[PDB]
Amino acid sequence: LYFQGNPVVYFDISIGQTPAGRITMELFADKVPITAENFRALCTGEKGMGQSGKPLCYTGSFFHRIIPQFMIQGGDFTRGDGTGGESIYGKFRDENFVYTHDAPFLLSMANAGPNTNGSQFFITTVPCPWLDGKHVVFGKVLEGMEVVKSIEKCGSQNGKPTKSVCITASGV
Numbered sequence: 389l390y391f392q393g394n395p396v397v398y399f400d401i402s403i404g405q406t407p408a409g410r411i412t413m414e415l416f417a418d419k420v421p422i423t424a425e426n427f428r429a430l431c432t433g434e435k436g437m438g439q440s441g442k443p444l445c446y447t448g449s450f451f452h453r454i455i456p457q458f459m460i461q462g463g464d465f466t467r468g469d470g471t472g473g474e475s476i477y478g479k480f481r482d483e484n485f486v487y488t489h490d491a492p493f494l495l496s497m498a499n500a501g502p503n504t505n506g507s508q509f510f511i512t513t514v515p516c517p518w519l520d521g522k523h524v525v526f527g528k529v530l531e532g533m534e535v536v537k538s539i540e541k542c543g544s545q546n547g548k549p550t551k552s553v554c555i556t557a558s559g560v
Contacts, residue, residue, distance in 0.1 A: 389560060391530060394418055397431040399446065400557040401535055403542060407556070411511075411532035413495060416525075422483040423497060423505065423526040429476045430463070430507055431558040438474045440466040446507075451553040454543030459516065460536065461498055461547075462555065463508035470498075473507035480505045487525035489516035493536060495527035513540050 389396045391414045401408040415424040429435050433445030442465055453461040453470055466472035481503045489496060489512055496519065498508035511529060513536065529536060542551040 394527075395424065395428050395560065396530065397428055397560055398558065399431070399532075399555045401539065402552075402554045402556050403538060404551045408538050408553075409532060409535045411535050412530045413527050414530050415495070415527040416487065419486050420483060420524065420526040422480065423524050426475050426477065426480065426505070426507070427495070427509065427526060428560070432560055433558070435476050438466070439478050440472070440474050442466050442474075444474070444476055444507075446555050446558045449555050451539055451542075451549065451555075453547040454539060454549050454553070455545070455547045456540050456543045457514055459510040459512045459514075460539045460543065460553075461508065461510040462553075463498065463506070465507060470508070475506050479503065482524050485521045485524065488520045489523070489525060491515055491528075493529035493533055494525050495529070496523045496525045499523060511536055513537070 395415045398412045417424040435444040438444045449465040451462040464473045494512045497505045
C-alpha cells in the first residue's frame, strides 16, 4: 500500500496489557530510499534473521526511551535498552539530510554519531531543530497521532517508560 507514491507501514501497540491502537506511517522512499527501505523491511520482518541472531523485525520490541515534550524511541530488538539493534544491511551511512525535524510526528533515525544507523528510530512529538543534520528524517505518521501521544504519556524526564509499550504487530 502506498501514499503519494511512498510505502505505508504500521505498528500495532500495546501499553501494559492493553491494546492502544495502530500507528500508520508514510516512508519517504522517494527522497530517503536507503533509510526508508531499512525501516519498511524491519516492519515486515521479510529479511529473516540478522547477524545478531535475532529476527530483523520490529514486532515484539518496545519503546524503551520516552521523553515527554520531545520524542518516543524504539527499534532495539537485539538488546532492548538503546545499545543494540541492527539494520537490514548488517550499520549504515547517513544517506542525506534533505528533511528537517520541523514538525511533530516525524520518523527519524537514532544514532551514536555519523553513519551509525541501525534499527533504532524515534517519532518526534515536537519540532526538534537541534537534531537537523545529525539524524536522518525518513518518514511521518499518517494516522494514530493519538496513539503516539498515549505512548508519550508513559515517559519520564529521564526517558524511562512507566508502562511497557510494545509493538505487538508490524508490517504493510
